[PDB]
Amino acid sequence: TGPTQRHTYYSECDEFRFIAPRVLDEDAPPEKRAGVHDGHLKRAPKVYCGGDERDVLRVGSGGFWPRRSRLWGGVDHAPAGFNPTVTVFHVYDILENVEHAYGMRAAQFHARFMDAITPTGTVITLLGLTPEGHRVAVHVYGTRQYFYMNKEEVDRHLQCRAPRDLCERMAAALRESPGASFRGISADHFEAEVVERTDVYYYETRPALFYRVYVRSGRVLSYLCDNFCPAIKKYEGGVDATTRFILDNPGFVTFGWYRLKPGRNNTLAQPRAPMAFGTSSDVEFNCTADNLAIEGGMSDLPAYKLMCFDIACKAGGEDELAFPVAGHPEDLVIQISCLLYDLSTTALEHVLLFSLGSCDLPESHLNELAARGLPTPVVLEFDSEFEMLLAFMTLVKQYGPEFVTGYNIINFDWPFLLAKLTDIYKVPLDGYGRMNGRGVFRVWDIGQSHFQKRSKIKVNGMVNIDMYGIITDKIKLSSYKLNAVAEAVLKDKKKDLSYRDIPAYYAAGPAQRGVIGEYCIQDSLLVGQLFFKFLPHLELSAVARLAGINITRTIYDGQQIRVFTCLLRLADQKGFILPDTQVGYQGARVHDPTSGFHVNPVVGFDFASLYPSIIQAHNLCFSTLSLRADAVAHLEAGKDYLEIEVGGRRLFFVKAHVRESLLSILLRDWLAMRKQIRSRIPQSSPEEAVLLDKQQAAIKVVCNSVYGFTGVQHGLLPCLHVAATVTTIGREMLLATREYVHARWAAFEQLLADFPEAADMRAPGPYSMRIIYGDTDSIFVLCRGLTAAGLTAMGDKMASHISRALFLPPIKLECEKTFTKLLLIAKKKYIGVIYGGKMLIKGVDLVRKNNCAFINRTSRALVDLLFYDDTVSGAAAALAERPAEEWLARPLPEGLQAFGAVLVDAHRRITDPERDIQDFVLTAELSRHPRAYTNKRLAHLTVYYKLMARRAQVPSIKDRIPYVIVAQTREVEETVARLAALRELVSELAEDPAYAIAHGVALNTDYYFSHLLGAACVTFKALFGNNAKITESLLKRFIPEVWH
DNA sequence: ATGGTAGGGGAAGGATCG
DNA sequence: CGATCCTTCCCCTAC
Ligand SMILES: Cn1cc(C(=O)NCc2ccc(Cl)cc2)c(=O)c2cc(CN3CCOCC3)ccc21
C-alpha cells in the first residue's frame, strides 16, 4: 500500500547543487583551476570505489559501506520469511512521540492501541537490540501525563464544583487558544480524579484535595501549565511521559534488558507490518506496559555500534589560506574520516574515508594500520560536496550507529556538516535519525543567550558522546588540543595539523591529499582509543539507570533533573506531590590560619561526606522544615524538633521520629546500595568489576549532588533553608571539634590517659596540641611534643573518640593524613609533605593551569628544594628563630643560597633562544560570549578579537585560549594606535603563539621574570610573617641589581 | 534553561591624601 | 598634582 509515516530521508535524487574545487581538474589549464565550480546539475548522485561506481542512494546487491537497514523507501530489503520471535531485548534510548488514530487507521493495529490514541495519544518507543543483533523498537501505548491542582483553590476560582466541570473549562480554554491549535477538543478528552495529597513544603502543611488531570499530548499539557489558570499552583506538570512510564511501572529502567510477556487480558504484543514502521529498525512491536518486564540475569551490553568521526574542510574564497566558513558556499567539506566499532567487543570493524577528489593513503600509514591488526581502510571518491555529504548521511541512516563520538564535534564538525546540509543544499534532517521522519536533529550553541550554559547535540536514537567534554571533566590540562591530550593520556604522540597547510596538500594531488586522509584517520583512531579507555558510555548509562532518566538527558540536560526525578519517585511513593515553580546563603568559614613553615608533625582530620551526613543525622528535608513556631509548638523542644538560627531567622526541623526526611531516605538507600555493590568487587570478574565501579561512581555522584540541588535558587524544587542549615551545622561542628581538641588534650596527661600509646610517642620538646588550619570539613592540628611515629594510627582512635562523643550518626570523623612538614601560605592555599614522602600542593599557581610551564617548573624546583633539602629546611627554621621583621637590614642565612642559583638560571632560559615557546605559553578560559563583558580589556579577549580580524580559528564559546606577551616595538605601538583609532604599556601585548612564531615576534623578557619573582613572593611570603613587600625586598637579594 | 560558597591574587581604572 | 592606595571584575581554585 505504501508507508504510513512518510520517509523523509533522501532515497531518490535526480538533480542537485554541484560545488567542487577547480584545483582537482587536471585537463583544465593550471591557470583556470583556482576558483571553485558552483552550479546546478541534473544527474543521479554517484560514488566511486575501487574503480567501480554506484549510485549513492542505490541499496542492495553491491555496496561499499556496511548496511544494517531493512526498509529503504518502501522497499523491504529483508529475506522473505524473516520473522524472528523476540523475547528479550536491550534498551538504550527512549523516544516520546504523539500518534493519532485517524493517521494510523491505514496500519493494521489492534483495537487496544487505537483506543489508546483515539484523538491523540502519547507513545513511548523503546529502542535497542535483541541478543541476536536485530535492531528493534517497541512502542508502548497507554502512557499518560498528569498533573495536580488544589481542589479548594480551583473550585472557587473557576466557579466549578465537579471534575467534569474542570474538564469543560480546560477544553474551552484550549479552544479559544491563539492559533486554534486544538480545535474541537472537548471535555471528554480529559480525565480528572479527586485525590488526597500533601505539598512537599514545610511540616505545618497538612493533606488536602487535589484534582489530578490526565493529559494525552505533551503540547496540551504544556499549553495548560503555561497559560490555563496562572494564579493556581500546579504540581508535577513538568513531568514528561517517559518519566511517568518509568516511575509508574515499578522496576523499569531507562537503560537495560527488558522482556516481552503476556499482559492483563492475556494480552500479547503485536508486531508491526513493515509499511507501518517508524524507525530504521529490523523489527518493531506494539504493546501496553504490562506486556513488559525486566530480565535479571542479563548484564552485558549487546552488539551496539559506535561511529567515531572527524572532518576536515578547506576555504574557497579569494584567500584560500583563511579558515573556512560553512555559510560560504565556496568553502567546502573536503574529507570525513569515519570508523565504526562494535561496543560489546570494543573492536574496530570498519574504516571509511569520504573524500572530495579520489586519493591513495600513504604507505607508511597503511603498513602501520595493517600491522596493528586493524582493518583495511576503504576510500570513497566523490566529485561534489553534495554527493559526499549525502553518502555520509545515508551511511548514518543505513548502518544506524547507536552511538557516535569524536573530538570537538559539538562546536565544529556537526554544526559545519548540518549547516551545509541545511542552509546551502536544503536537506531535511528529521528522518536521518532513528525515526523515518519528524525526529530530532538540532544543535544548540551558547551565543548571546542568558539561560543556556552548555552546547548540546540531540539526535533521536543516536547517543552523541563528545570526548572533548569527557577529557575536560576527567583530565586537568592547560590546553586540550587532541595531540596534547593524546601524548598526556596514552603517551602516544601523533602529527599536528593546521588549516594554513590544508590547501597546498590538496592541490598537489591524490597522494598529498591521502596525507590529509591519514591525518584524519589518525585523529579518529586516537579519539576511539580515548573513548574505550575512559568508557563514558558505561558511566553515563549507569547514571541514567540510577536516575530513571534517558541517556540523552543524562548527558546534556543537567544534574538537577536526576535528583528531582528520584525525589519525585520517593515523594509520590510517600504521599507528596512536587509543586512546579518557574549569592543566596552563608557558606562555610575558613579557619583563619596563622601562616608559616611547620616542621613539627601535623595531623589531618576530615569528615566523611559532611553535608550528606548532616542531612541524614538532623532529618533535613522540604517536609521536615518549618518557619513558624506555632507549627512545632505542640511538641517538646530538643526531643522532638531541632531549633536553629540560620541567616538571622529561626528555623525548626522536626526530628526523625515525627516525620522522616525524604532526602535522608534517598541518601541512606543510596549509601547502603553503594556499600553493597562495593562489597562484591573482590569476588567478581574484572569484566563485571568495571561495571560495578561505574555503578558506585554514579551513586556517589548523585549523593554529592543532593545538597547542591537543594541550594539552587530559582531552580527546580529549591529550598535554600536546607542548604544554609547544612552549612551552618557544618561550621558549628568544626568549631566544636576545635574547642574539644583544645580543651580535652591540652595536657599530655590526658593524651596518655585516653590512649596508652603516647608513651612510645613523646618527643623531645614540650607538648602542645592546637588546631592550626581548617576549611569546611577539615582540621589540621599541630603536635609539638609528639613523635610522628604512629600519629596516623593514634589519630584514627582520636577521631573515632571525637565522633562517638560529639556527633550523632552517621556523622564520622576520620584521620586521613599526617604531614612531616607543611607550609601554611594563606587562606585555602598550602603545600605540604606527607609522612609517606608524597608532596601535596593546593591553591598555588602550581596547580593553576593558567600559568606558563616555565614558571611552573621553576617554582616547583624551588618548593622541592624547600622540602627535600635539609639545609634550606634548617634555614627556614632559622628564619623562624627570629621575628623576620628585622631582616630588612639583616642577612639571609647561608642555606638559602641555592635559591639564587635556580633564579638566575631562569633568566638564561628567558632570553637565550632555542627555547621552546610552548614552554612559555599562558592559557585562559573564555567563559561567556565576549559581547557580555565588564572589563573588555583582557589578554585572551585581545587575542580573541585579533584572531577574529585575522580570519583565524574562532575559538569555541567555552575553550581555553593560549597566548604570549610581546615586547614593545615601533610596529607594536603603531598598530596599537591604529587599532584604537579604527575602533573609535597596559597588557595589550598579547598574541597567538601561532602568529607570533611565524612572524618572529619576541617575548616580553621583563614580564616573565617579574612574574617568576611575583610567584616566588606569593609562595614564600609565609616564612616572613606573611608580609609581601618585605618578601619582595629581601627576594631582591637573590637577583643581580641590573635586573630590578 | 536548569551548577554552591568560600577564597586569593592578578589586571585595570578611579579616588585620595599630603 | 603625582604615586599610593582602594574597587571592581575575572581566573580558577578548595571544600
Ligand atoms: C565538586 N563539587 C560540586 C558542587 C556543585 O556542583 N553544586 C551545585 C549543584 C547544583 C545542583 C545539583 Cl543537582 C548538583 C550540584 C558542590 O556543591 C560541592 C560541594 C562540596 C562540599 N563538600 C561536600 C560534602 O560535605 C561537605 C563538603 C564539595 C565538592 C562539590
Numbering used by the authors: 59 to 640, 694 to 1095, 1138 to 1197
Sentences from the paper on this structure:
All herpesviruses encode a conserved DNA polymerase that is required for viral genome replication and serves as an important therapeutic target. HSV1 pol harbors 5′-3′ polymerase activity, 3′-5′ proofreading exonuclease activity, and is critical for viral genome replication. Additionally, HSV1 pol interacts with a processivity factor (UL42) and functions in the context of a larger multicomponent replisome complex—reviewed in refs. PNU-183792 is a non-nucleoside inhibitor of herpesvirus polymerase.
Here we report the ternary complex crystal structure of Herpes Simplex Virus 1 DNA polymerase bound to DNA and a 4-oxo-dihydroquinoline NNI, PNU-183792 (PNU), at 3.5 Å resolution. An exonuclease-deficient mutation (E370A)18 was incorporated into this construct to prevent exonucleolytic degradation at the 3′ end of the primer strand. The primer-template DNA consisted of a 23-mer duplex and four bases of single-stranded overhang at the 5′ end of the template to mimic the elongation state. The HSV1 pol ternary complex adopts the common B-family architecture with the protein domains forming a partially closed channel that encircles the primer-template DNA. The association of the primer-template duplex was facilitated by a large conformational rotation of the thumb domain from the open- to closed-form. The PNU molecule fully occupied the polymerase active site cleft, overlapping with the binding site of incoming dNTPs and forming interactions with the surrounding protein and DNA. The central methylquinolinone of PNU forms stacking interactions with the terminal base pair of the growing DNA duplex (dC1:dG1). The morpholine group occupies the space that normally accepts an incoming dNTP during the elongation cycle and is anchored by a hydrogen bond between the morpholine oxygen and backbone amide of Y722. At the opposite end of PNU, the p-chlorobenzyl group displaced the template base dG0 from the position required to base pair with incoming dNTP. Additionally, PNU disrupts the active site by fully displacing the template base and locking the two helices of the fingers domain into a catalytically incompetent open position.
